[PDB]
Amino acid sequence: GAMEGILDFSNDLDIALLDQVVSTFYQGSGVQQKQAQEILTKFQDNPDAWQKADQILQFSTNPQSKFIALSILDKLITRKWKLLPNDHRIGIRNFVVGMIISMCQDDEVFKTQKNLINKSDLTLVQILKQEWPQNWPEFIPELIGSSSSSVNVCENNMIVLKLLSEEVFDFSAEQMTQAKALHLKNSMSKEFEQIFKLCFQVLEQGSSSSLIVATLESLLRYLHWIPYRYIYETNILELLSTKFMTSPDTRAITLKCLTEVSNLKIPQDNDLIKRQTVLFFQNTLQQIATSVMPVTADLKATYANANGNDQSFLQDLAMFLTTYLARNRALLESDESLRELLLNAHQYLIQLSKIEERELFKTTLDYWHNLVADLFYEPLKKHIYEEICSQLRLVIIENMVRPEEVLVVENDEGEIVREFVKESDTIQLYKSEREVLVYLTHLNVIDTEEIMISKLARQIDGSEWSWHNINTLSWAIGSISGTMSEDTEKRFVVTVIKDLLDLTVKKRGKDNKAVVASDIMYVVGQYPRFLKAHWNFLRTVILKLFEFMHETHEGVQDMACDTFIKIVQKCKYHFVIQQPRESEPFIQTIIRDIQKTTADLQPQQVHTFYKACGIIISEERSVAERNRLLSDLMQLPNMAWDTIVEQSTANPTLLLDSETVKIIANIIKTNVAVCTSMGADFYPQLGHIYYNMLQLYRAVSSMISAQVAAEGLIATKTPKVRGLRTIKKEILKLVETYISKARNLDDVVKVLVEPLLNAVLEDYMNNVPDARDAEVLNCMTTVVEKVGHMIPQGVILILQSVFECTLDMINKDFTEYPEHRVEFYKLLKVINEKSFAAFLELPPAAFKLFVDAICWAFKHNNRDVEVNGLQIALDLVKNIERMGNVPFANEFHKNYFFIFVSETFFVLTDSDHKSGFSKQALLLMKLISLVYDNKISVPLYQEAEVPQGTSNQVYLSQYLANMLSNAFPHLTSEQIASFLSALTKQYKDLVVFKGTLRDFLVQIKEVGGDPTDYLFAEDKENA
Amino acid sequence: LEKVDVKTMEEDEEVLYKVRAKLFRFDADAKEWKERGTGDCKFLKNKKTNKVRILMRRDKTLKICANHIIAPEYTLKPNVGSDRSWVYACTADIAEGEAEAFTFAIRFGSKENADKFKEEFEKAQEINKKA
Amino acid sequence: VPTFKLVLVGDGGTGKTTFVKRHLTGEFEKKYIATIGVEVHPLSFYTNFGEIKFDVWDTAGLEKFGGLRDGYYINAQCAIIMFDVTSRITYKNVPNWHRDLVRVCENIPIVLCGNKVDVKERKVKAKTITFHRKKNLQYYDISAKSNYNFEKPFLWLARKLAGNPQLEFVASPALAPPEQQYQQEMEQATALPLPDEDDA
Ligand SMILES: Nc1nc2c(ncn2[C@@H]2O[C@H](COP(=O)(O)OP(=O)(O)OP(=O)(O)O)[C@@H](O)[C@H]2O)c(=O)[nH]1
Ligand SMILES: [Mg+2]
């Protein structure tokens, strides 16, 4: 209705209506707000809307209308400014400068329309990016003179210069060509002496808190790039660290400025700059202790109360102290007069490390890591920090977070439950805490042992008992494994374990028993050195894990199986020998009792238990003994298998029996688990089941095919068919895991591969798309990777059976069958690396589909596919290059060289594939190099397309000039020719070549880009 | 802002049964299931009326994702995709405002939990019928 | 009761609209349909300080659909910048979103969220993620899919905006619910498989 009136540009713009459209969008709601939104987006996007901007700025009574007019002008200035007659260009600059002056003059508007003034200031800076200084040489001297005219104009000028510095130095890379960015940086550098004088004058003399704050904000940006003499040779560091730390309005920005200075690498032989760096740190800490809070203050409380800007200030202070000390604490460590300042600054960091805020704790911990690693390695330093280190031991011990192996956690209603999600953030924080604590413990193993043992006493006697407290102590105790002598560790671990054992005696109830069991398991898994030297202790520990496997808490049972694995990975030798005073190797006793030990476990935990037994067995290196152990371990699953095979061989309809399918899947998963720990040693068990297994794969396959035909593609989502497909998937995973690890590749080729190919490939090709398992391609990729070099004809079968029918599933869109798409390109990749000759046997129509499939991969946004795509293209080009000056190579270039060049230009240049930029460039450089290095033997053009014997060089350049001219018609022929002249000279130098592509990507977003920008590199080759 | 004590409106109910669950609603305008919430599903019996409702809340935000009487008329049916889920038609759910009809599916950790849910849902239907 | 404008920004595809919808209706939208310009959605939470309300301006991250772009940020009282930890280029763009945002909104609480931490092959690891530190932003690893930390950005914002760090999410009141034609919808709902039967 009426709101659409503003989209009619044949009529005058109605400002009062536009104002109402804008207020409907910002202040209204629901459907009206929605319609106003779509209208304003059309108005802003009209190619002519910039012509209304002056009118809106003059007459609008809505500051949002004016802000959007400025966005309109911003897009013109950034994209089309050069197309514009000098008439429009001067009038724009005049009315934007005029607007800013108006606003500065109106004290109430300057105070109340910050948003609009800051946006107007930004719009002025965009015009500076286009016209200054070559067409506005007076800008800076004038801005400096006009600053005395008015305290609002001076303040606003600081804003403009802050945004100018940002746009030229912090954000130019990737939004301006290299040449333009250099031009602007040079121009600001040449005028900076005048700007610093103004900025310094205001700081020594200025008055208005808001003017001082705007000046310091601009100073923060200049500190990113300006010459060091401005920082150290003026009196500015004394100002920042005294006067501006005292006043709260300037404190936050001052600390950020000093943090920028504090990260600077200083010239080491300059004793006066050293003294200056000491002095500003001295002043800054004195001001904090005087004006903000003394070293003793409880920053944990201050931070939790969150009054005013306290959290931000405590974050800025941690950043300032950790930045300066990581760079300069050596300046403070040798002079005895500075010792108190060194230790006070470390003491504020200790108080900051008590704050409950994970991100801030990680910032301080990263510094403590830097410090304690230096104390561990650097001579004569640890003694200075002894008292800081003591306090830090306590802070880390008390704030330990949950290791990843601890599978039990408190839910929101105070119950101890199995964790549903792994927490990568917390697992990382645990690892950084451990690294710091380990160094700390090496620095004073006596002090660490005393703190932990004394905390442990307060847990046992109940005085400090809580889940939190026993957890953080146990995690800390586990985390320092490896730091004590074997003697000290023995005494310490005996004490800890006896104490945790007596805790599981007091502390009844499901919750308490889960907590303490988690902590005993975590500690015991962390000390295999101790276990290995103490057989009676190791034996008792495993027996206690087997007890924990009967516990009704699933977290506890899960943790018991994982700790069993974790112990046997280190301790397996002691399970395989016969120990003194025992009648047999413990592994025999374990295998014998497996049914009893595991009766209360879920199937997944049982498979883990078998995997642990497999780790033990593979320690035994005589083949006969190891083989018998494997046979004894596999007794239960092999007996279940034999009967399941007899039975379901005699009654195929069992495979529809939910129960039978679950028994089969569990037997195969058990074999996967043992195969995963035994690897090459698993062969004799795989040999035992292999023939009947692949017959089962075939019977299950025919069931699936049948069910789908009888019930529809929806059958693939039913519990029956999903149970069947789980069986096939586990069979493929078993074979893959074995081949993955095999040492005898001859038996893989001569015994495993041919029955495998024959069971799997035809079945995959002949099922409907929804019933094909992507895991088939995954298994084939392992096969080709391990043994491809030995089965060139098998590789050809693989390709014939999966290639065209997979390509057909994934080449309609980018979304459907995401796993097949990923495995497909993995498999094509490994075949192209290892068995390139398979692709030479393809009939030409299929080879064409292969090139098509590579280009398709590279239009994906799915990272794993795109990356494989670009890599295959590179390797294919290399494979072709490697062949002779031969008909196949020559035909390849005649048919596909330009397909690859244009497809790679396409993804480089559209705005949808920015993540593949490096590999697109590498591919392009190699394609250019084939021509410029004279690697292609044959003319790439057709007979009578071009004069007598023209080079591939000049033909490539003509092909590209034409391609780019049609793809980017707004570019001049000159800009295209300069671009290409640069590229074709830079194709050996990745850094330069990519700067050239990036320049092109800037220029294609605008009109009238300067073609000389592509000679940027010819002048650092000059300079 | 001032601390506000205002409460759950479950204080005059007894918890007959509680189970962890994931709730879905059927979207007919698309041909699809949409998740509505994961959390504790509770059967709450009013101590005054002896009426039993299902009240389910999402973890963390504690927002309500099912709030309806367990009507005797309702029937739990299997979904073709699952051995651990029920589907049933609800005629008056107020989790999101005024009463609306839905087809819900509720899925559990295990077939054992789905089985106990059914037994308790039918127990509650009996309570509701005969009072 | 109080309403706060929240602007949600970040690269295309990082999970902005998915995360909002998850909070609005509980659903997990699997498809990617890029937002165009902005969509505005009211979202309320019940707290121990009463109900607090956000108008969530879920903005477009693809440049072709940017719409008014920074014009969306005017009057925002808080913000979430989102990236995806499975795509490095989305974290590389975070300083660009933050720059454009704080030029318009100089003094608001802002949460940085690294989404999709449920994905095995994580590309932007913990030690890379440090942008928030000098910029005083609150940072969470989150996953709209697994719900990992999915409530934390709003809880943190609510505490900042209410100026009360003891604010907590509480159970909303559960009013008593009230006392033939629907048989076809049951036929077909029972015949359509629930998603993620083997995730679950
Ligand atoms: N694995 C995983 N996928 C997610 C997660 N969150 C979102 N997604 C998927 O990521 C895609 C992102 O979708 P959107 O939420 O529409 O993206 P967006 O950030 O709004 O994109 P624009 O609207 O273009 O700015 C969808 O396919 C989601 O299913 C997550 O936590 N984990
Ligand atoms: Mg979106």
From Swiss-Prot, chain A:
One of its GO terms (cellular component) is perinuclear region of cytoplasm. GO terms for biological process: mRNA export from nucleus; nuclear export; protein export from nucleus; protein localization to kinetochore; ribosomal large subunit export from nucleus; ribosomal small subunit export from nucleus; tRNA export from nucleus; tRNA re-export from nucleus. Residues 36-102 form the Importin N-terminal domain. One of its GO terms (molecular function) is small GTPase binding. SUPFAM superfamilies: ARM repeat. InterPro entries: ARM-like, ARM-type_fold, CRM1_repeat, Exp1_repeat_2, Exportin-1/Importin-b-like, Importin-beta_N, XPO1/5, XPO1_C_dom. It is found in: Nucleus; Cytoplasm, Perinuclear region. Keywords: Cytoplasm, Nucleus, Phosphoprotein, Protein transport, Transport. Gene3D superfamilies: Leucine-rich Repeat Variant. It comes from the Eukaryota. Receptor for the leucine-rich nuclear export signal (NES). Present with 7080 molecules/cell in log phase SD medium. Belongs to the exportin family. PANTHER family: EXPORTIN 1/5, EXPORTIN-1. Interacts with GSP1/GSP2, polyadenylate-binding protein PAB1 and PRP40. This is Exportin-1.
UniProtKB/Swiss-Prot annotation, chain B:
Keywords: Cytoplasm, GTPase activation, Nucleus, Phosphoprotein, Protein transport, Transport. GO terms for biological process: G1/S transition of mitotic cell cycle; protein import into nucleus; RNA export from nucleus; ubiquitin-dependent protein catabolic process. It comes from the Eukaryota. GO terms for molecular function: GTPase activator activity; small GTPase binding. This is Ran-specific GTPase-activating protein 1. GO terms for cellular component: cytoplasm; nuclear pore; nucleus. Interacts with GSP1 and PRP20. It is found in: Cytoplasm; Nucleus. Residues 1-130 form the RanBD1 domain. The keyword Transmembrane helix does not apply. It comes from Saccharomyces cerevisiae (strain ATCC 204508 / S288c) (Baker's yeast). Coiled coil: none annotated. The chain holds residues 71 to 201 of 201 of the full protein. Belongs to the RANBP1 family. Important for the export of protein containing nuclear export signal (NES) out of the nucleus. Stimulates the GTPase activity of GSP1 and GSP2. The gene is YRB1.
Swiss-Prot record, chain C:
The keyword Acetylation applies. Found in a nuclear export complex with RanGTP, exportin and pre-miRNA. Forms a complex with YRB1. Interacts with BUD5, CEX1, RRP12, SRM1, and DIS3/RRP44. The gene is GSP1. Signal peptide: none annotated. PANTHER family: GTP-BINDING NUCLEAR PROTEIN RAN, RAN GTPASE. GO terms for biological process: exonucleolytic trimming to generate mature 3'-end of 5.8S rRNA from tricistronic rRNA transcript (SSU-rRNA, 5.8S rRNA, LSU-rRNA); nucleus organization; poly(A)+ mRNA export from nucleus; protein import into nucleus; regulation of cell cycle phase transition; regulation of nucleocytoplasmic transport; ribosomal subunit export from nucleus. SMART domains: RAB, RAN, RAS, RHO. Pfam families: Ras. Belongs to the small GTPase superfamily. Ran family. Its main location: nucleus. Residues 61-77 are annotated as: Switch-II. It is found in: Nucleus. GTP binds at residues 11-18, 61, 115-118, 143-145. GTP-binding protein involved in nucleocytoplasmic transport. Required for the import of protein into the nucleus and also for RNA export. Essential for cell viability. By analogy with Ras, Ran may be activated when GTP is exchanged for bound GDP by RCC1 and inactivated when GTP is hydrolyzed by Ran upon activation by RanGAP1. Transmembrane segments: none annotated. One of its GO terms (molecular function) is GTPase activity. The keyword Transcription regulation does not apply. Residues 1-164 form the Small GTPase Ran-type domain. One of its GO terms (cellular component) is cytosol. Residues 30-38 are annotated as: Switch-I. This is GTP-binding nuclear protein GSP1/CNR1. Keywords: Acetylation, GTP-binding, Nucleotide-binding, Nucleus, Phosphoprotein, Protein transport, Transport.
